[PDB]
């Protein structure tokens, strides 16, 4: 077993290192394909904030559990069951959406199956390759450039953009002139991953000028 933590202070992180070492669990700073557990700081109702580790843990169908799993196991002197500490929701998408459990149980039906995604333009706080990894874990293929979409019958194309990261450059309004795919904000990906439900595009579409 291999874990990351998210939202912990240095002191909480060092306690988890001791816990993981005791129980023969690897602890890493960054998530990997071999990660089995993501330990999120939560409130006492198992609601967390959305970090990259949260998204990637769900996208991988991993155990996304509250830090209380660690502290309560210590208190009770017994390794407790992850399913009793599973994160129930987050402050953006809702307190009890159960996305983590849904993803853990739904990897035979991935939310972005049959989609080809171009993560286009600049992004803040989450490099392009990490957003690409996220969508690929959820079944999408990725292309680098708008001209690289397949435009076939076995996949559907989508352009994903973060308009605020473009600052004074309005070019994100001109993608439709270059490309036939729908253009949505990064929140379409993030909301769909957190909920482990592919959202409709309607509320995420970026207006395109002719």
């Amino acid at each position: 077993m291999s874990m990351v933590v998210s939202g912990l202070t240095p002191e909480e992180f060092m306690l988890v290192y001791k816990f993981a070492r005791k129980h023969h669990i690897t602890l890493t700073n960054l998530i990997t394909e071999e990660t089995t557990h993501v330990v999120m700081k939560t409130d006492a109702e198992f609601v967390c904030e959305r970090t990259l580790k949260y998204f990637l843990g769900i996208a991988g169908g991993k155990w996304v559990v509250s830090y209380f799993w660690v502290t309560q196991s210590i208190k009770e002197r017994k390794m407790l069951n992850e399913h009793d500490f599973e994160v129930r929701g987050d402050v953006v998408n809702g307190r009890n959406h159960q996305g983590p459990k849904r993803a853990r149980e739904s990897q035979d039906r991935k939310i972005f199956r049959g989609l080809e995604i171009c993560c286009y333009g600049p992004f803040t706080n989450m490099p392009t390759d990490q957003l690409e990894w996220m969508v690929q874990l959820c079944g999408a293929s990725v292309v680098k450039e708008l001209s690289s979409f397949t435009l076939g019958t076995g996949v559907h194309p989508i352009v994903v953009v973060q308009p605020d990261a473009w600052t004074e450059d309005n070019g994100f309004h001109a993608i439709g002139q270059m490309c036939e795919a729908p253009v949505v904000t990064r929140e379409w990906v993030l909301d769909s991953v957190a909920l482990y439900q592919c959202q409709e595009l309607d509320t995420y579409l970026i207006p395109q000028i002719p």
Partner: peptide, 10 residues
């Protein structure tokens, strides 16, 4: 104080 990890707000 939390961590340095970015959060993704609504």
């Amino acid at each position: 104080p939390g961590s340095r990890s970015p959060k993704f707000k609504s």
